[PDB]
Design a binder for this molecule. Structure first.
Ligand SMILES: Nc1nc2c(ncn2[C@@H]2O[C@H](COP(=O)(O)OP(=O)(O)O)[C@@H](O)[C@H]2O)c(=O)[nH]1
Ligand SMILES: Nc1nc2c(ncn2[C@@H]2O[C@H](COP(=O)(O)OP(=O)(O)O)[C@@H](O)[C@H]2O)c(=O)[nH]1
Ligand SMILES: Nc1nc2c(ncn2[C@@H]2O[C@H](COP(=O)(O)OP(=O)(O)O)[C@@H](O)[C@H]2O)c(=O)[nH]1
Ligand SMILES: Nc1nc2c(ncn2[C@@H]2O[C@H](COP(=O)(O)OP(=O)(O)O)[C@@H](O)[C@H]2O)c(=O)[nH]1
Ligand SMILES: [Co+2]
Ligand SMILES: [Co+2]
Ligand SMILES: [Co+2]
Ligand SMILES: [Co+2]
Lengths: 375, 375, 375, 375
């Protein structure tokens, strides 16, 4: 198997540790790191590589990403470069991707994915326990979108559709790399695209649980806009009824993960009152009253009680239809709109406890799916 | 929709309450109670029925079960009689079954099923939080069997395959009632059969979670042997890869359920030393040494440490191949064998806490599925 | 025993229920309700009383509170009126107080206190599980104060020093009513004074745990200022080393209590920007820089990250030394100061989970006790 | 301070690690290991000592225990030897004891005790989270005894009265070593005696919480009889009302501790049926019927449902009055009697979950204290 670590700016020792873990694994035949630019991380890896592959017997190499897509040159280009290399320059049966920033990485992650692949599956996705104010793009943007636009499909059931830790087999990777839609997604939209098109092609999927969680490095705005844009670009797509989808049963959350805070609330409330623009005030005219009045209040004081579940779904539709990717005002507006949803969820749900928050989030997708199936 | 309550011996007020709840529901067009015999429960319902249907506007009636199967006349005959009535004497689009003994029954159960049915599903199964020493037939017999015999299929993933609370639509019911295999299962085997053949036909299934649990009346032996027999009778069947199967994400277990005890341990230990027979001691010759020696010890003192996970799987295969349904010695032997498994799980797993027990049980099915895929 | 319910404005049926519970208890010899004014609740009780005491055999009566203290005529006057009545016009050995608003009241509360009293104790205080954003006066004002000013004593170890549910025996009541310091505390300061002087007199105290919690009616400002003022007035008091103090071991919090929210965050954030005054801005000159700059920001936008644990202790000392009871500006400033503490605790601690929040609060008192012992 | 590790047979590296931890601690001026005999552990320490003390600057030495008591030469003699050494041959202000077998020992244990000592306390006891089937001597024998014999005192409130991890200051040590009762307790009875007489002298006590628990090496019979014997020997003692006793607030149990099993159930059930004697059967004549009949059943099959809470208290009184220390039949009978109590608790309480078990155990002491205060 080929194991791939895409990296942009990262601590050399963190990446090197993961590289060494992967190389030492009996089922890994090659390690490839794909870099954004030729920075210090890059040179650090390039120096260590001869040594690592000499010690473990499995070859390790670095490359810059190629420009394969047509959006902002980001992780997509990184990942698709690995796909191309994997497909065109190696003979290996399977490819793994893991984020380079991971500090809780162990041989077990590779084993669990390899074993599931042996069982037949075409895509194996790792998924993790998460703090109740983490993963707000995942929940309020990706999974919400999937639920609202493809309620009868497997999409919204996938636990971590943005996750960069997965194993695909050669034919699945070929399938995706062929696909014009995924190829062009050079930015943060790439994981969304991998998730969507594998499901749309009826690839069978297993979700691995990694009980110890994904410790990593601790931009949010860019990721938010590009994820939403990814969903918007797919909105007219047609998806068949489910292929095989199974998920390893989750363990209880680790205490240290259940007990941490996703963000700085004071700073977020502040941020909500900044970067206003007469054009944004105008754009709000497109939204339902509660939302329009709600968000306008944020010029003077933080307001978010208005942005409950049903308000957010209404807002999501309007965004789907009018959001202009690349327009600074629309991006700021999406950022602010989403922020109020996060804040509302934080104060009315997250503050009720980890378990309450989980039961809520799942019920939220269910309510969205049901509503969607009504129209 | 038609709502059906199969009853044998039950407290009249308990059943009448459930009947009244169902009749009052806006989506229920008829209630049917199917009785084993014409006892006091029966006459109680028959007297109340004119009154209830007058007050709610939806018709309510009682009938004796018909003899439709070829095994012991039990619940199967009860449920298939309802199927027949539903298919042949009404025009309704959907049928529910709920156990008559349920005391925690509420309009919600009907709503959740009807809503899932609207979504498209062919079978909707209710499932509940359960005490860690409950559902030992479910886990050690049914789910174990499904995992060991059809590891690549959806069968072992179904949460409560013995569950009597479900909704099917007309074509799914027709399809089951048609089927020689389910029709003949007049005994406790019926839920196993409903579960098996719906999955084998690729019916799409949704599992509803009812967070408050299923409070009901608190024979075990009969149920055990007939459930095992059901599985044994299906052992040569071939099952395709999964159809659509989705399950509502579960809430945390209610405290009162997590904190209760499934059985009397002292009495069970005693029961293990009773009803011995020279023929049973001989039959043990067919089992691996640890098991044979283990079970033999039980003539003098309770012993069960020997009956771990791998020992039970070995035992299971031997049972599948040699267990003679209706033979008193085999039934007693199955009962004792299983009892050791339950005791072993109780002392080495359940005693470790509710969560540990759950993570264990799910991993057990996984280990069994993996092992089965190996041969 | 005499059981006493002090009431101001309450639902007649809620109080009448509690009255009836107490009167029906075999250990209760009289029930007394003490009213603030002769409103509808009062007339409701006065009408029902003859009937209740006829049915249960134990006498029930209502009275207006007398003016016995020298601050705002509030709960103190209510409770001391009961004390006077108890001591001067009855011969009973023990007196209970319970808030009239309680809806989870049961004969058990009385039993548990009566049994503890039998054991020998002089004061029995009931304490309950509480939502993690509840009891912010209790934690940030009363317990904090106790820990900061009397670190070596039992005071800060009392679970719910503001609690209105307790049982005292005749001599304890006599001792309190005698005391000019407690007599004069006619306002919300009274429970603080009851707690302080019983500990100062070395009365032996037992804390009863009521596992179901105290459901009650759902002013904050007046209570806040009067509680703080009570502490301030005691600040030069000397207190001896601990007498007997024991507390029933707590059960796990009920889910419904752990999962509810103390307050409306948006509204609180808004309130923090209101009722400013040039005089308040000036008064801030007396506080450390982080706090002064912090609170000032609140004229434009909510700010509270600055008001951590240590910042709060710093603030507390300044308040102890300069806060003028009755001065509208000081009262407003204390309200805002405390609100920022609550917000800080909410976002950095409470959001981490009920358990984390409890471990934190107890460590906070520890950190405060230690710090105080240093000077 | 002097830190003492008493050892009998232990893994050299485990003890040496703890010695090195203690010596490296800035507050520790000397380490002393006290051995049972001159075995391998002993020689291993004797060799390492020069080296350790050389490296840390704080002297380390080993000695055999002196024979100072009049019972079996065990741990008591070991600890009292340390006491003597401390008092007679050093000038140090404080002494710690820690079990030598501890594998989760850290500088933190010493710090927490030293800081509490700084606060004024005479005795500091460490206490830990424990598995719900651990500490059955502690609960069913020591705490139960203290509750039943001295209900109005602090004794039954001490968390871990058998605990070997504590810090005492010079005068407390002197006071104990002076005392004929404690001196003569050369066996396992010693911790019981340290606990009892410090409380009887009104020494102020603080209980430190060590949240990570006490991992140690995994005889039971001997310990059981000598702990019971200790309590029996004190039964006519008179104890005053409480001196100062405070306990650090506990954190949530670590998962790994909540999830482990204190013993082998099958083996225990077996053991209950062994080492019977006609004289034991006769001795049972002294006990209440349910118990006499119950225990007799154990000759044929395990029985324990009979040995609930009230049955155990009745049994305890009989034992207090008739148990003959040193009589093999009485010792066997106590062992069996206790074993049924443990089994009953295991099956009716422990199996209900860790929290339920704790709430139960504390209520048990409460029920016992109340019952005791009745006569
Ligand atoms: N090659 C490449 N890697 C990237 C790029 N952007 C992010 N990454 C890497 O993708 C992985 C996930 O990114 P990260 O910033 O940790 O986002 P996270 O998903 O929030 O954990 C990390 O290894 C990043 O170094 C990019 O533009 N090119
Ligand atoms: N008609 C009919 N109903 C039965 C028969 N046996 C059991 N039942 C009913 O089927 C439902 C489930 O039975 P129950 O004894 O509660 O088993 P459990 O809850 O699944 O353990 C109850 O309503 C019983 O009254 C039978 O032979 N005929
Ligand atoms: N007699 C009298 N009772 C009062 C007064 N103020 C409050 N109470 C009562 O004291 C009890 C506690 O007050 P409540 O408003 O519920 O405060 P809580 O402690 O936050 O629950 C209730 O029964 C009130 O009706 C007062 O001025 N006089
Ligand atoms: N000096 C001495 N130490 C002993 C004796 N018996 C036990 N110990 C030590 O006392 C400590 C506690 O004993 P241990 O067997 O671990 O019992 P437990 O941890 O309380 O169950 C350990 O360090 C033992 O090595 C004895 O007779 N003499
Ligand atoms: Co990352
Ligand atoms: Co039932
Ligand atoms: Co109230
Ligand atoms: Co030990």
């Amino acid at each position: 198997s080929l194991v791939v670590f895409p990296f942009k700016h990262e601590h050399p020792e963190v990446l090197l540790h993961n590289v060494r873990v992967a190389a030492a694994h009996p089922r890994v035949h090659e390690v490839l790191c794909i870099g954004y630019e030729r920075d210090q991380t890059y040179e650090a890896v390039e120096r260590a590589a001869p040594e690592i592959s000499r010690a473990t017997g499995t070859p390790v190499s670095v490359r810059l990403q190629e420009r394969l897509g047509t959006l902002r040159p980001g992780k997509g280009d990184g990942m698709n470069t690995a796909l191309r290399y994997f497909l065109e320059e190696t003979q290996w049966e399977r490819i793994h991707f893991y984020d380079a920033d991971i500090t809780s990485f162990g041989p077990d992650w590779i084993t669990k994915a390899e074993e599931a692949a042996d069982f037949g599956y075409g895509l194996v996705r790792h998924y993790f326990p998460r703090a109740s104010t983490d993963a707000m793009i995942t929940w309020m943007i990706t999974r919400t979108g999937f639920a609202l636009l493809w309620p009868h499909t497997e999409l919204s059931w996938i636990e971590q559709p943005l996750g960069g830790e997965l194993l695909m087999r050669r034919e699945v990777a070929a399938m995706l790399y062929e696909d014009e839609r995924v190829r062009r997604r050079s930015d943060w939209g790439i994981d969304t695209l991998y998730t969507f098109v594998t499901v749309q092609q009826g690839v069978s999927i297993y979700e691995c649980y990694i009980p110890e969680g994904k410790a990593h490095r601790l931009d949010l705005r860019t990721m938010l806009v590009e994820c939403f844009a990814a969903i918007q670009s797919l909105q007219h797509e047609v998806v068949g009824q489910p292929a095989i989808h199974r998920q390893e049963h989750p363990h209880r959350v680790p205490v240290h993960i259940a007990e941490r805070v996703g963000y700085d609330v004071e700073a977020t409330l502040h941020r909500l009152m900044q970067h206003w623009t007469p054009r944004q005030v105008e754009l709000l005219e497109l939204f339902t009253t509660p939302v329009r009045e709600g968000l306008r209040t944020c010029q003077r004081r933080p307001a978010f009680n208005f942005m409950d579940e049903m308000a957010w779904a209404a807002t999501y539709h309007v965004l789907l239809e009018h959001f202009q990717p690349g327009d600074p005002d629309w991006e700021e507006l999406l950022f602010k709109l989403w922020t109020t949803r996060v804040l509302n969820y934080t104060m009315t749900v997250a503050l009720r406890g980890y378990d309450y928050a989980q039961q809520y989030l799942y019920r939220m997708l269910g309510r969205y799916r049901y509503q969607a199936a009504l129209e």
